[PDB]
Design a protein around this ligand. Structure first.
Ligand SMILES: Nc1ncnc2c1ncn2[C@@H]1O[C@H](COP(=O)(O)OP(=O)(O)O)[C@@H](O)[C@H]1O
Ligand SMILES: [Mg+2]
Ligand SMILES: [Mg+2]
Lengths: 18, 311, 295
């Protein structure tokens, strides 16, 4: 992946409002 | 003996589900909370050939007046889902289980919408929500969007960069933060990593990210999100209700109608010229943190729009 | 330089893409083969913000006249290592591809079986869509409630169970299955129960509001059976409800000689059907794909 931080669960709420 | 005029589809631990159950209880309407997450083990669903023949935990639910769709939890990678151990055991049967659940709950929601239920964000909008399609649907309809490039070809990236200037990259569908396209990213070593998956490149807009909330073709507020960087050791976020011109409003309402949303938190952002471009419309936007930091009421208008469907 | 007036979404290794390509080739129209199995690692697509800015392998392909959609979508090494990431990566690819298709459809492209139909195609909703619009469907029950299936049997009589979705032979519900031990297996294993129809399994193909043929599947031997104009009307209606342009449907007859719609398929196969009953399926399909180039 180019955006290596896609599957990083650091769930990360970057997908929350989807 | 349960009232199913308002249904809040989601798990009762979702802060936003709770918030709406409460906004609803305090206006008089107890809601039915439809948690798909406990479908096979702790819930009963029976569907008959007739669209009105829908039985959840023994009770018939042919046509709620309104649904607030927080999440159906269709994927084990979804937000409110802890499926980690089950996926580490067998990623195949777990995926199978989630698709098995999905088709049934989707059938329920689609039957409801067919019956006339006002679904606050119906799942059918998924097709229009696909971003590479959503942004073009808006653009060709006269709304401004960033100069964009969804691709897996490094040469297209290089030429788009030479056309545009400063650029950001971000996920095609979502799942990571957008970041400035730095010169390290255009070196062959890493830009060739586009063969694993495409990404979205866009013109770096430098202005203000504004979140606009739209419910039933009306703008509730418009919150300007500022990153406070006076101190680098405590960078905070100031969120302020602002007035937007009526032109901007009508454009947001149009966009919401184009994609097919009733309740939408859309993000816009101004360029150097101080004029907004649309970034994205969200299908199950959050609102709690915005309400708190900006001292506005979004949950209230949503609950009132839901209750207005029972009339 | 290619034509891209007619685009076939699928793999060259697929027999149907081959039939459709060969048949198109014969008719005079060389198609384009969007082999999306190559998408990330091999081929390249680039989308701009303008719906027309669709570039496959460097060549702009805005607005084909017609599309035949067959397929769009090894991972165990990656999912057993990072399943969240791998699922997200596959979503990135599929999002870009689905977009190309949706962009074409918005621009005017007659996509033969647009992915937008998937919504209407979810079976426990598809059969309710057919019924609630007046079409003959079998009495049906999707459930994980053992009491619900006991009364459904008691009300309709002998019945069958087919999988909730996908593939498994239809089986007959026998009294032994209704016992507590056997019936309780559906406490977490939902299947679809349906009144047992005794007539012939007949498959009917519909293209652009016209029936093409109908074959009684009775080594199995399938043969062409002409049907009434009524059921034909009902078939084309069902296909216009679900929102399909080319469909292969399964209908079955009750004991009273009336047919019930069982299921429409998003993209039905036809090679193992036109080679067992001697009719032409690929032909009329290619005829339609070409016919759109005059609109
Ligand atoms: N073209 C752009 N220029 C500048 N900033 C952007 C651009 N696109 C996105 N951003 C910033 O990144 C954040 C996330 O972008 P968005 O498109 O909302 O992605 P997601 O919905 O996946 O979080 C936004 O708040 C915005 O501030
Ligand atoms: Mg988003
Ligand atoms: Mg956003």
């Amino acid at each position: 992946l180019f955006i290596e931080d896609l599957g990083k669960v650091t769930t990360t709420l970057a997908i929350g409002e989807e | 003996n349960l009232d199913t005029s308002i249904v809040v589809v989601g798990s009762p631990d979702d802060l936003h589900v709770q918030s709406v159950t409460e906004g609803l209880r305090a206006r008089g309407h107890e809601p039915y909370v439809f948690d798909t997450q406990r479908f096979p083990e702790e819930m009963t669903v029976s569907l008959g050939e007739q669209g009105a023949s829908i039985f959840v935990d023994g009770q018939q639910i042919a046509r709620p007046a309104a649904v607030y769709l927080r999440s159906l939890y269709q994927s084990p990678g979804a937000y409110g889902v802890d499926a980690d151990k089950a996926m580490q055991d067998n990623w195949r049967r777990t995926l199978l289980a989630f698709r098995e659940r999905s088709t049934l709950m989707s059938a329920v929601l689609l039957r409801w919408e067919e019956a006339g239920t006002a679904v606050y964000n119906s799942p059918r909008a998924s097709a229009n929500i696909t971003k590479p399609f959503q942004l073009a649907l808006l653009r060709d309809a006269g709304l401004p969007v960033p100069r964009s490039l969804w691709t897996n070809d490094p040469e297209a990236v290089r030429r788009f960069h030479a056309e545009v200037g400063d650029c950001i990259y971000k996920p095609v569908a979502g799942g990571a933060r957008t970041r400035k396209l730095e010169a390290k990213d255009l070196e062959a070593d890493r830009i060739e990593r586009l063969s694993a998956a495409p990404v979205c490149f866009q013109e770096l807009l430098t202005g203000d990210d504004v979140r606009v909330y739209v419910i039933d073709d009306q703008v509730i507020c418009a919150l300007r999100i500022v990153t406070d960087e006076i101190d680098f050791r405590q960078a905070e976020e100031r969120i302020e209700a602002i007035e937007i011109s009526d032109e901007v409003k009508d454009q947001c309402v149009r966009a919401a109608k184009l994609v097919g949303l009733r309740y939408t938190g859309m993000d816009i952002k101004a360029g150097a010229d101080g004029n907004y471009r649309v970034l994205e419309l969200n299908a199950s936007a959050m609102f709690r943190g915005f309400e708190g930091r900006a001292n506005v009421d979004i949950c209230g208008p949503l609950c009132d729009a839901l209750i207005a469907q029972t009339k």
